[PDB]
Amino acid sequence: TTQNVVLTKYGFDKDVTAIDRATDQIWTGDGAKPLQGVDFTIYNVTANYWASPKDYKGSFDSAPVAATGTTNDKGQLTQALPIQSKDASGKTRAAVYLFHATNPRAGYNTSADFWLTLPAKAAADGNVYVYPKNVQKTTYERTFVKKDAETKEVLEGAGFKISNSDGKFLKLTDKDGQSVSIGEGFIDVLANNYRLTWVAESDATVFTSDKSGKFGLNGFADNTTTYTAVETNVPDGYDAAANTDFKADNSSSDILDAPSGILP
Ligand code: NA
Ligand code: NA
Ligand code: NA
Ligand code: NA
Ligand code: NA
Ligand code: NA
């Protein structure tokens, strides 16, 4: 015999704190953003808890995995869980489950671990509703406009790589670390739930100026680190721009490409 636990992850403004809600309350978020693609492990902590209930403080040491999952487009993750389970001595008990975020949405801190006993108070539909809490982090972005140095008009199709002070280069991956194909323009890492990794130059992501000359991305961790934009694919008939040092300071600035001279 099991109960359906429905986990819903909402994203909140940095300075707004959610009130606790009972497990029999169906809460729309009012209308905070549902967070898709968030990974949770549910641990069966029945044995850890019943070792000494008054001392339990959220340990999942040696606890088996009851289930894993990922939030969907509604920020939701559903899982049927046995209401009873065994303690360390093989005695049957009311089951205790601990919910552990293993991969938070880009731009968010990991949720706090929480746990509960089953059977729990359920909503009118028979489901048990939980709502993990976390804090949105402040991330930063940078935009560049590629231009013709002579005409001052924007330049489409110029390719760039980005390096850090270690000489490693930026590669965008999906939430699971896999490669992704990146096109032209400003890349919305936050909306796409991408990750910034630092790799060898040959494996780096190439960013390309779009029809308005624009390229760049959001999702930088800080605004103090210096990075370097290096032009790797120069439009035909131009000379490469000098390397451009920058901070992810939410600004936009121009990068100039000089037309190649032709002599008689
Ligand atoms: Na997981
Ligand atoms: Na355990
Ligand atoms: Na018992
Ligand atoms: Na994620
Ligand atoms: Na957690
Ligand atoms: Na791009």
Numbering used by the authors: 39 to 302
Any passages from the paper?
As the first reported host of “non-pathogenic-derived” pili, Lactobacillus rhamnosus GG is a gut-adapted commensal lactic acid bacterium (LAB) and one of many clinically investigated probiotic strains for human use in the prevention and treatment of certain gastric ailments. As with other Gram-positive bacteria, sortase-dependent piliation in L. rhamnosus GG (called SpaCBA) is assembled from the ~30 kDa SpaA (backbone), ~20 kDa SpaB (basal), and ~90 kDa SpaC (tip-located) pilins. Our findings show that the GG-SpaA structure has certain features in common with other pathogen-derived pilin-proteins, such as the Ig-like CnaB-type folds and the presence of internal isopeptide bonds6940.
Discontinuous electron density was observed between Lys47 and Asn172 that can be attributed to the loss of the N-terminal isopeptide bond. The alanine substitution at residue position 139 was also apparent in the electron density map. Despite the overall fold of the E139A mutant being retained, some minor conformational variations are present near the mutation site, including the flexible AB loop region at the N-domain. Here, the Asn172 side chain is repositioned closer toward the C-domain and thus able to form a hydrogen bond with the OH group of the Lys47 side chain. Moreover, the Ser149 side chain is rotated towards the domain interface. In addition, the slight shifting of the AB loop backbone has occurred, but with a major structural deviation (3 Å) at Gly69. Because the K-D isopeptide bond was held intact, the structure of the C-domain was seen to be largely unaffected.
